[PDB]
Design a protein around this nucleic acid. Sequence first.
DNA 1: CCTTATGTGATGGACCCTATACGCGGCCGCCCTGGAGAATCCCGGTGCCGAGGCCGCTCAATTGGTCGTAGCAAGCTC
Length: 49
Amino acid sequence: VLTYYGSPQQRKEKRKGWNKPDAFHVCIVSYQLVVQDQHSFKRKRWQYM
DNA sequence: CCTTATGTGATGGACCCTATACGCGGCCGCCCTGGAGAATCCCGGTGCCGAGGCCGCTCAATTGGTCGTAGCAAGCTC
């Protein structure tokens, strides 16, 4: 489980490695960051939402 | 005047002691070596929404005619 929250520098530090297969099983994120960071989530494919 | 051998009185020199290079070692400038890492480079790799293409159509660019006076050609002259 990846908890995607924090200030942008640590936020992008948490992004590091997201593209690798099986880097994580589930990601949990808040709607504020979804409206903030939409590009990152939209680029990845998220199976069951 | 001839004729020994040295007085006269300084500039020229050897010396005392000074202070120094450096054996072994360190601070430091520096070559460079060295790592960690803090950026920056280029290539995807993707999903978005505008560039630009297509069509409907209208009004103004184009046309042929007319009128007339602004630019042109001497060319005089100062």
